Amino acid sequence: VPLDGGRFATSDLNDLYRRVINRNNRLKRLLDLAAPDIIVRNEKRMLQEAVDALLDNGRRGRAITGSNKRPLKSLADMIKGKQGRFRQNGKRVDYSGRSVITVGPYLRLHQCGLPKKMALELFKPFIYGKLELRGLATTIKAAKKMVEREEAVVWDILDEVIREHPVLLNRAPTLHRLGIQAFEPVLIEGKAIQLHPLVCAAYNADFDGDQMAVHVPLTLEAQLEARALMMSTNNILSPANGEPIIVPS
């Protein structure tokens, strides 16, 4: 792919494929040219050293990259573990945010604050559905502007989209299953995700700079699960031992 500015940013599988095709194309010239056998033995053993640096690089002299000094990345190094598989054991994810948490002790046990600046960007495509069903905007491009100017009506439609829609708060080093719980949001103003006090002892969170990612369950079978299975009032006893986990801290 060409980087912006005139310079290209290739992979490093194009150096190991361009070296198998040279030493293999020269080995055809050397055989139709009838070279002495002392040379076409240095080409067979030199060809199959380039093919064995392609598949798994490192079980030999570790053919260092060109134009640099670090070893290239063979095919068996993309599959080979980074502590995780190439596929899903990692999945960065859409419809998400993150911000600082604060106290907000006025809440119930099943809700959480959520700024009006994240509720309007997490729930954007849900808003374009109301602004055309309710009949305010005409097309979906004309509605994309009303969510930019923040007219007085989009706050009326954003407050209605967030009616019974639970969101999944989750802290950074999720140790046990109580690191991901759901909460019914309530729009506050500011830029910090509030959080009930009884719940922070389960996340193991102090309020001195700790950030908390917030996801969004889209489908209809994924909101009846963030309400019956992963809600915050369904998790009052820890699963390690039956003793409670909502202890006033």
């Binding site: 240095n42 053993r45 030199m46 050293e49 030999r60 002299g61």
Partner: peptide, 14 residues
Amino acid sequence: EIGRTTDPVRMYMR
């Protein structure tokens, strides 16, 4: 004399 040498430079030089 065939001392478990891998790199093809030394194997070609000798």
